[PDB]
Design a protein around this nucleic acid. Structure first.
Ligand code: MG
Ligand code: MG
Ligand code: MG
Ligand code: MG
Ligand code: MG
Ligand code: MG
Ligand code: MG
Ligand code: MG
Ligand code: MG
Ligand code: MG
Ligand code: MG
Ligand code: MG
Ligand code: MG
Ligand code: MG
Ligand code: MG
Length: 126
RNA sequence: AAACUUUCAACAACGGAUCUCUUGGUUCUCGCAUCGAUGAAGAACGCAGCGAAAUGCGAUACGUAAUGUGAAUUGCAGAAUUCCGUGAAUCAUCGAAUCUUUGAACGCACAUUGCGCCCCUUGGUAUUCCAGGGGGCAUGCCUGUUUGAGCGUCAUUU
């Protein structure tokens, strides 16, 4: 239950705040949990998702597939992961949009800001 | 007997009801006090690699700076060794700037993209003419400054 008179339980307001979120807010909204191995290694549970992250799909119809995130398509709230495609009938190959909450990060793209982000969230960085 | 006409069903039409949704409205409550001659509200015209609008901006033109975040944007195209970085982004924030023609709108005028005058500077053999660049020139009122006007009026003068 809500205890503060600053946040809203209004469903209409929550949906406007989701669907009209700018990209810097959608980055936090498009978070993805880590794997068992990375959660043991880094001490933290979920991070905002990145391009060069390696992921495993754990839901839907492409579950159990691997790849690198080809694109974080924040305008569609989606991630496009290579090796996860739809073969069209003309021979074209279109990327299937995935949600990061149905993904599991199995290898992070680490740089200085990601390391500081892990340490900020309390992570082991090991 | 058909055709025709009528009724009913199924399927197909016409049409967009019903149901289920909802980034909208409505009403109540709480908190706050902030437009403009330092040029507002409003208007017109423009601005994007491909845009008519909406939204945003002003010839620095869907923006510049600065700061925070930290890798997007994307409908295509392009750029993406910049990506362990004073650093992507139609991102957030926003204290520095720009801000066309206007508009209370302020040289005058305006059904004109009309006509002046002043200063500095530049070019044309130029203080005077023509041109370009920059800066000015409204009204009422207040305080002050300077220059004045009035036998309104006081001293001082062979
Ligand atoms: Mg990070
Ligand atoms: Mg009301
Ligand atoms: Mg203006
Ligand atoms: Mg205005
Ligand atoms: Mg209008
Ligand atoms: Mg433009
Ligand atoms: Mg437009
Ligand atoms: Mg600019
Ligand atoms: Mg940007
Ligand atoms: Mg913005
Ligand atoms: Mg300018
Ligand atoms: Mg402006
Ligand atoms: Mg005239
Ligand atoms: Mg005329
Ligand atoms: Mg006066």
């Amino acid at each position: 239950a809500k205890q503060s008179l600053d946040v809203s339980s209004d469903r209409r307001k929550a949906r406007k705040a989701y669907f009209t979120a700018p990209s810097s807010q959608r980055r936090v909204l498009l978070s993805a949990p880590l794997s068992k191995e990375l959660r043991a290694q880094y001490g933290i549970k979920a991070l905002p998702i990145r391009r060069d992250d390696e992921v495993l799909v754990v839901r839907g119809s492409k579950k159990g597939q691997e790849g690198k995130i080809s694109s974080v398509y924040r305008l569609k709230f989606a991630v496009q992961v290579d090796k996860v495609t739809k073969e069209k009938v003309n021979g074209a190959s279109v990327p299937i949009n995935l949600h990061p909450s149905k993904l599991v990060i199995t290898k992070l793209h680490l740089d200085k800001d990601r390391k500081a982000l892990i340490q900020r969230k309390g992570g082991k960085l090991e």
